[PDB]
Amino acid sequence: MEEKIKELEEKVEELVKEALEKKDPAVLKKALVCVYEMKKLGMPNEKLIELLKKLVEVLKKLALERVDPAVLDLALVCVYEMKELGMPNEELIKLLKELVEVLRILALINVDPAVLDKALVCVYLMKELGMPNEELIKLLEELVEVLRILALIRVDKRVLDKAEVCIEEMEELGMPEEKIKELREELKFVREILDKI
Amino acid sequence: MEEKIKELEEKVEELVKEALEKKDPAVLKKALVCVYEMKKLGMPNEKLIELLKKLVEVLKKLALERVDPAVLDLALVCVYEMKELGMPNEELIKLLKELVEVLRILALINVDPAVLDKALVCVYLMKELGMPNEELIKLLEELVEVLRILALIRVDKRVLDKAEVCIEEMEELGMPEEKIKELREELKFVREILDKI
Amino acid sequence: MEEKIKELEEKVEELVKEALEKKDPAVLKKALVCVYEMKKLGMPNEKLIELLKKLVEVLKKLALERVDPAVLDLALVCVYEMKELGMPNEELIKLLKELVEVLRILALINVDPAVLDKALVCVYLMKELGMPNEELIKLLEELVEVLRILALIRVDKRVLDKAEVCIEEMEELGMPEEKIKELREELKFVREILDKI
Amino acid sequence: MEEKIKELEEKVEELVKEALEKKDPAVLKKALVCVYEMKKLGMPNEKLIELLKKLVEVLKKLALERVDPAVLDLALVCVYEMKELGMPNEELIKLLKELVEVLRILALINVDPAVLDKALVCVYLMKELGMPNEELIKLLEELVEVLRILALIRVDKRVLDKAEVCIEEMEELGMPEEKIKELREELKFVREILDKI
Amino acid sequence: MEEKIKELEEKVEELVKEALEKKDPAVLKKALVCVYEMKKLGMPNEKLIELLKKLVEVLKKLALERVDPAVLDLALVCVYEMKELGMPNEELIKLLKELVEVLRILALINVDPAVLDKALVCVYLMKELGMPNEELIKLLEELVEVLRILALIRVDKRVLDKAEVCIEEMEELGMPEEKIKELREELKFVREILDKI
Amino acid sequence: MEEKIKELEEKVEELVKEALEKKDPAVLKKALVCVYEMKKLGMPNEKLIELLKKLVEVLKKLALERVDPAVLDLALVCVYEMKELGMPNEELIKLLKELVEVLRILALINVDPAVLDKALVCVYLMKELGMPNEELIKLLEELVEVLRILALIRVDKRVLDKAEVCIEEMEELGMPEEKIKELREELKFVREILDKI
């Protein structure tokens, strides 16, 4: 067995090197096939976690350097693979904070609200795993920001309701109602412009 | 007769050797046409079964080494051809276990729930052919898992209802009610997340 | 006159030789135009029937060596041309029995139920022309087989209703009710699986 | 003036020779643009009629030698241009018989019922201009045949209703009622088949 | 500043000479951008009207020498630009007569009614700018002609109602009622044929 | 830190230099990624505002020299980046006047009503930032003009309703009614033309 495992690590290594030059996730799909083969053979769970890291920490670069959200969907399923292998909860929370930030930047520059839905499900996953409350308030305020901006750049009334649901999450978590009211006013102001269109 | 049969075997052989380098099921389609011609020519039923194994096995490799679902549809047909030629029930249950265990990995890595329906069809086929109750529950737990994951990776409420249906098949198959309620609570949690959207 | 007739036979045979190498029906479409021109010139009706055979018996080979079913639509039209020219009803039934077989192999290998409707139309045309009942039972049984298999590969409830209609044709031919009940049981079993989906 | 007129005739000639080698109506669209300039320059109306004839009698060759219907739409336009220029009624009736007599063979070989509507329009145009009554009935019987054949090759009930309306034109034009009942029986037979589908 | 002004005239010249040989309007879009820059630089209004004439009198020639309608949309815009800069009403009416004629020819040679709406808009614009009722009637009779022809060639009931509205404009402009009755009879004859569809 | 900041400034400016020659926004998207990296590295706010200016003042020239509107969407995002980053309100009003003054040309030369919505939201942003009444009213008259022109160049009722809403913004913001009544009469004339269609 261990010969194949080393050869599959070599495939993952060769494919990382090639993928960074080709800028395409298909090269890393082959690498995940090899990761799942190593898992099927049986391998140290920590080595499988670090192999998964050695892909997540390359998928970000690929997703940025060729602006594309779909590359991150493959990354997200590998986060649940590290969950199932027993990566520590603090490390999951670290990784998820980090991936939320590449969604946040990519959703802005590509001008697309649908990509933010990944961020919302990741924020609820960190609510499940127990990230500190002020840090949820931060990512919800931030994602309310990118929803607000995209609702102005592209005309669609629905985008503001998602932000209002995220305001109710900050209300449910507890925050000074002065901030809540400020945010509400901004969203209803943007609605009063989209009402015209 | 026998010369055409041998020349059709030689065609299957060379088409297989081409297909693995070419990476396309279009090559294997002509090989399967030639398998049907050898059926019409009355080649021995066991030889057809073995040639069909020596296409199912190549379809698995092709489907993995360039990821899409469609290649497997030929394998699903060829399983019923082996049923009809009289391959033993134990060998059908073997290949159906094995092929479900390629649907599962490809559904994850390509991020698509639609392929999972074929796995459910194959589960009910192994129910028809008499797989043991625990082993049916095992694939139903697994496919409930890949449904749960794709219901988180993309927003669509319907995916969880198919999972709920499959939990009720494990209930029909006598799974412990404590495990049923654990699984249910997870799916209702994912529905409460999708209710936001 | 006869110079144009020979030149059209030359066009037909040289385009046949070309088409087999190029693998496309568009080469034969020009030959079929040249066949209609030979009809317009009053070429003997038997010579025209034989020229139509010399296309039908090449259309099937093209339609196997590449898998697309649209090539057969010319064959179907040319069967009615031989009907109009007065080819014997027994020989129509022979050509139709032959053509119905290529429809089966493309339905299966292309994994597509929509082509089978053409087989149902041809079964009813042999009902019109007077095939012996037990041979309709064969084709009807076998076609409900391909319908049953594609209802498992491709998930759509409607396919089984065509199969029920074709069981009612076997019941209209008076086939023993033991077979009807077996076929029905297998179909409501497949419906009960598709009811899940 | 006459220099431009002759250079436009030369353009028509050069474009006709080019079109027949290139096999594309866009070369002839250019020639018709030039004919419309020659028409605005007020050259002899009979020369314009013969120039339009020398495009109609090349559009048909193009439309056969590669099969698509849209080439004929130019021809049908130029028929009304020749009507307006005052071409004798028997030439219109002759050319329109000829175009009906290309719509048939192209509608058959492309297996497309939708083109036949242009034929029915040209039938009613020859009803306006007058034709010997049995010749309308011949073209209506023929088009009722291509409608019947395409109602078998394409599964769609609607095609038989157009044919029924056309039978009622043969009824209005007074072919004997036994022949009408033969046509009707054949069409309700095809409807009883398409009722299954 | 005058250096940029003459350089923008030279850019118009260069891009015109390129466009007219290359045959694509995208080259003239840049020349118009340079015209709008010269307007912003306060180039004299009559020079700008002549520069605009020196593009309209090339858009038409491009739009004939390869046949598509969209090239004329620029010209329709630039006419209102010339209106704003103070082109004489007689120059507008002349030029709009000229452009309406290229819509009329292009609507025949390419089998499409949708372009004729732009001609109807220009008719109402010359109604606003004060063309005589008799000349409006001339264009309305012509556009009723091309509507009638396309209604027959490429069957759709709806096209004919626009022509009825345009007959009511000739009635409003004042036309001898026997002519209105002739046109109505021809148009209802065309509807009675479009009932056979 | 400062080495990465200088390298990111160099990576911006060298992509900008080639973006102008290549003529595509995908080059500048990578430069804007590197701008967000320089904010992440804490480069001083006034240098980041300068870089955002340097980028916007190249986005416009690209969006003119190739005529498509989507390039401006980045510019709108970077304007809100400068808002948040703390560029003074009067020079936001300057940049927003300047950017509206490319939409107003690009909407005409590549005929499209839909882009004007991006201008209307920027007008209401300059309302929020407090540009003077008569300067908004000028842009609203101008955009009511481009809405008027496109409502004539292509048929759609809705374009006039946006313009009516915008005229009522001028009534709210304060302008005498003779302008309102003139504008209304013109828009009602365009509705009366579109009522024909």
Residue numbers in the entry:
A (entry chain A): 1 to 197
B (entry chain K): 991 to 1187
C (entry chain I): 793 to 989
D (entry chain G): 595 to 791
E (entry chain E): 397 to 593
F (entry chain C): 199 to 395
Question: Could you pull the original sentences from the published paper?
Answer:
Here we describe a systematic approach to generating modular and rigid repeat protein oligomers with coincident C2 to C8 and superhelical symmetry axes that can be readily extended by repeat propagation. Repeat proteins are composed of an asymmetric structural motif that is concatenated several times in tandem within a single protein chain. From these building blocks, we demonstrate that a wide range of unbounded fibres can be systematically designed by introducing hydrophilic surface patches that force staggering of the monomers; the geometry of such fibres can be precisely tuned by varying the number of repeat units in the monomer and the placement of the hydrophilic patches. All multiplexes follow the naming convention CsHRN_Rr where s is the cyclic symmetry, HR stands for helical repeat, R is the number of repeats in a single chain and N is an index to differentiate between multiplexes of the same symmetry.
We determined the high-resolution structures of five designs from C2 to C6 symmetry by X-ray crystallography, cryogenic electron microscopy (cryoEM) or both. C6HR1_4r matches the design model with an overall r.m.s.d. of 1.97 Å. Like C5HR2_4r and many of the other two-helix repeat oligomers, the monomers of C6HR1_4r interact at the inner radius of the oligomer, but the repeats fan out towards the outer radius. The C6HR1_4r interface may be stabilized by a repetitive cation–pi interaction between tyrosine and arginine side chains of adjacent monomers. The high-resolution structure of C6HR1_4r is the widest with an outer radius of 92 Å. The inner radius is 41 Å, which is large enough to fit a C2HR dimer.
